[PDB]
């Protein structure tokens, strides 16, 4: 019974996130969006954050440890358990984390400050999220389809 | 619309972009919306110039809230491309934030410029 209640709570969290912030829900999804809203406190409190802040929300202990001891800061925070940074591998993971955090900052500012005529469909209420997700998936597949370095193909002699 | 401290007079717009170019050569300038937000939140920012040609205008509307909380003057120029190549960027810059220091002719220009922005408000 606890599992059934937790499943319907996850469905409710998804529906309420698509109600509140359709752009960010179209970008990363309802659970990671709810984690970001939770850490920042509110939607208009998340919207006042730069993209570099939204990149490393949640990784703050490692961040301030590294900043105070002149180590190297963490590359991402809560954003790591989104969908779109999990397809990459290698340094393209950190590059996609940067780009995704910037698009999340734009989408949260749009979902927290833009007005709508109240007869506005959800497909046009999540327009910035749709456009940013399509562009960001194109940039991800370019970063993954970057070819490897050419080499000299040697014969059996060494010639 | 939502850009109510608009700089519409072209003499004032030319003065704002000339001071932006001088601060850019002094490396006293923070370019971009995220870097502008960081400078305004940290409180190092003396004046902040947003652009009104932003196609979703709501992606720079959070900076008026932080400037109302931190009491720094913000103003809207017409063209983001003009702001961009005023900073010397070769991109479209939608928000810029120019900072202050101990003693400069540039700091005197900053004080006079925020007096003119307070005349707009």
């Amino acid at each position: 019974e606890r599992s059934e209640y937790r499943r319907q709570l996850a469905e409710y969290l998804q529906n309420r996130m698509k109600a509140i912030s359709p752009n960010m829900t179209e970008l990363i999804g309802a659970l990671v969006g709810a984690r970001l809203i939770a850490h920042s406190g509110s939607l208009v409190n998340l919207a006042k954050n730069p993209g570099s802040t939204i990149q490393i929300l949640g990784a703050e202990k490692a961040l301030f440890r590294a900043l105070k001891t002149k180590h190297a800061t963490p590359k991402y925070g809560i954003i790591y358990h989104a969908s779109l940074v999990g397809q990459a591998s290698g340094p393209n993971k950190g590059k996609i984390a940067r780009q995704l955090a910037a698009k999340i900052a734009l989408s949260v500012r749009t979902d927290a400050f833009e007005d709508f005529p109240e007869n506005a469909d959800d497909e046009t209420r999540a327009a910035v999220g749709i456009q940013a997700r399509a562009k960001l998936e194109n940039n991800l597949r370019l970063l993954e389809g970057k070819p490897l370095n050419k080499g000299v193909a040697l014969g059996p002699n060494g010639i | 619309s939502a850009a109510w401290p608009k700089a519409e007079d072209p003499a004032l717009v030319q003065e704002l972009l000339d001071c932006v170019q001088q601060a850019s050569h002094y490396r006293q300038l923070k370019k971009g919306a995220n870097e502008t937000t960081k400078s305004v939140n940290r409180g190092t920012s003396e004046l902040v110039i947003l652009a009104a040609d932003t196609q979703p205008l709501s992606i720079v509307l959070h900076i008026p809230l932080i400037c109302e909380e931190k009491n720094v003057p913000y103003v809207y120029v017409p063209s983001k491309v003009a702001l961009g190549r005023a900073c010397g960027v070769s991109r479209a810059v939608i928000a810029v934030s120019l900072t202050s220091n101990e003693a400069s002719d540039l700091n005197s220009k900053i004080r006079a410029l925020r007096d003119k922005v307070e005349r707009l408000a």
Binding site: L67, K68, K70, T73 | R42
Partner: peptide, 30 residues
């Protein structure tokens, strides 16, 4: 630069709190 920025944020918060406390401790009125 990152270390100096964090130390400057901490020191600016300390200055704001100390200046508030100093004002609270200690042709004006017509």
């Amino acid at each position: 630069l990152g270390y100096v920025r964090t130390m400057r944020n901490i020191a600016a918060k300390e200055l704001k709190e100390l200046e508030e406390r100093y004002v609270l401790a200690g042709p004006k009125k017509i």
